[model samples]
Target: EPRAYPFNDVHGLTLAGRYGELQETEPVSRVRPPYGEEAWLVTRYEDVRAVLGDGRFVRGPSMTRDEPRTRPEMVKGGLLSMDPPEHSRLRRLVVKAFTARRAESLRPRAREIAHELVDQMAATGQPADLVAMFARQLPVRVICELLGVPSADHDRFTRWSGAFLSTAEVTAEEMQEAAEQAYAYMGDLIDRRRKEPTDDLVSALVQARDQQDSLSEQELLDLAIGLLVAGYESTTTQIADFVYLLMTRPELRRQLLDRPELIPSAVEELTRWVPLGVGTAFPRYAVEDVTLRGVTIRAGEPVLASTGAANRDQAQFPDADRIDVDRTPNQHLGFGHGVHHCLGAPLARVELQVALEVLLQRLPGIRLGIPETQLRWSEGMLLRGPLELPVVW
Candidate 1:
């Protein structure tokens, strides 16, 4: 019998409880999500990478077809919904701005932002909710700067973004309306950029669209919205999540405090150990039949890869469950794999490393403001994170 997908056993930092057994036994098993058709659930690390990296499994068809998904409505367009040639085209047009060099260039500004927030937190006294004053603030500011969003419009922009990433937290009508509003807002930005080109990324994209005809008007709107939403959401969740982990586990905090240079490695290890997304991944439809561990996936079928579970597979990382700051060669799939690998990874890495480094150096005595049992988490969301990380330093 096919198992139900989006395994409900997952919560903050916890993966689907049953995936471990499946990795050793039925590495590839049929499963049905909350909505849409049955799909092959690939659990082992090797198989997860194969599904994400292989061209035979594509994301394009899902955009046009009744694809396997966790939600009732299917997202229509954007980089996540497109396969190469088209995905590559849009990615190529924007890749330069997100390169390692570009992201590294933002480190100074990122550090400044981190310090500014830390200063505010310090001034505000102890028992502060880091999720609000710090984690949530930093990413939105960074992304808004990147996209040239005016300061006055940030609260509105953040609200719209919240709706897009919501599951049960928002109604279906609210999500749809937010999408439309965001797209319309982006469309207006594109128009403004076309008339008065600036140094921001949006202006650059506008130039590409108008002058070179590299992408369509709709594509521009979607891409702009996608970048803003992606850049803001995940990093916010992870920062609060990672900080919570460090605060709750004093050993992990002391490990970094003792060896300051280990912060970057710790960030990568945390990224590996932390189950960022819930059970479900964006489904990849098979363009042709493919076999994994003797399980045949026929043409036009969909496969969901549990990267969170795969990251915990001991076959790849010995003692994968433990958070070892010095874990070497940690090539985990936290940022995903292949052509669809996260474009903002470099930026995220910089932000995460800087956030931790600054917090540790500036607020060495930080700890949880309340007991771990009292913490609350967001429900029915794409990412799993604390609703408010109460911390005191």
Candidate 2:
């Protein structure tokens, strides 16, 4: 299965550079095999946005067992892949738990988590893997707390979440086992909530199931497990990437450190610049034959809208490759657009902003312990980040 396409040499530097060039020359370009499946690569900002927002482009069918989608995981039923009325319904239930109000309220908690991780790093002395100490731990702790995952079980959850996102090296059996464990854990928790309710997202989901008939038992389990996996994994990767960018780009780092108020914009800009999740977009399969940007996409063919490419399009962003923490109208597809956009976006924003602010404020002298060239990024086409960002303050 792996040898069937061009998944072997999908490096970040190559993809990032190619995407930037492609975005400038073509609005929508077709790539043939050797790069894996043949499909239209949406480059322009408007074209990518239109393809993502258009309901005609479905994200479901590609998930079928026999299809040639990006990965087996792409076939999974979650808010990110779903379309239309069903997507709207599932999104509403999950969105209720991750509302802007709820996310804003988490600022203090996020700050505390940031400080706690920073304190741990400080205790560990210099030359620490900031990814493990801060980027990874903070979001896992916060999401586990929200989902009511026990502290004793967090270490296991962390391992499984990492493997789940690192699908390139993770075997199907491993992914299945991780999914099973997560589902079983979430199922038991849901059952426990049934007997004794609590004031958390899981409880809210259970209540939604009972009162509003918003989700079925399977749907509830999938949603809970999905959020737990995606919430921690993506957020962890993004935070790590942001830290890496800041550490490497001293100018941007100094700018944020000097003008602390720019942390929010810094977070937004980082999302645009770092291009986490490798270079692949969330897989969207065509429901019907449709013409997009002069390309005829047939039904069942996968359509991947490269957010990384769109964010770096020279036409949309001047000096597209450079990292500017204050690029306005910086409408990047980092969190995606349209109804199927990321549900945890607000929470992620708060997490990134607070984490950056606290880290920069507390560790004013933070610097990369190892040379930038020696650092290793995770090997996968899914989530992307340094395996261990060695840093010292």
The candidate that achieves the highest lDDT relative to the unseen native structure: 1
lDDT by residue (tens digit), candidate 1, 1-393: 888776644364666556566667777779888778888887777777788887788787776677777667776656777777767777878775445775676677777778888889999998998877777777777777677788788776666676655311335576677767767877888888878988777776666532254665677776667766766777877777777777788887898889988888888788787554665457888898877777788989888877777777778877776777767666777556776466777778887888878888788888888867687775644677777788876
Worst 10 residues of 2 by lDDT: 1-10
What overall lDDT, based on C-alpha atoms, would model 2 receive against the true structure? Answer: 0.68
Q: What is the C-alpha local distance difference test score of each model?
A: 0.73, 0.68
As for candidate 2, its clashing pairs are 6-36, 63-75
Number of the top-ranking candidate, with TM-score as the measure? 1
Q: Lowest summed lDDT over 10 consecutive residues: which window, candidate 1?
A: 163-172
Error of 1 at 172 (Å): 12
Cα error of candidate 1 at position 349, Å: 0.9
Which regions of candidate 2 are displaced past 4 Å? Answer: 1-10, 13-15, 32-37, 63-74, 150-152, 160-182, 209-211, 274-276, 293-295, 299-301
lDDT of 2 by residue, 1-393 (tens): 112322223345424554555566655666443333566666677877888887788666654523334443334556655655667677667666656776776777678878888888898898988887888788877777777678898776766776666421245576677867777877888888888878777787767632375566688787766676766767777777677777888987888888998777767776676453555465677778888766588977776676766666677777766767667655576556776466777778887888779988788799998767787776655666677788877
User: What is candidate 1's TM-score against the reference?
Assistant: 0.88
TM-score of each: 0.88, 0.85
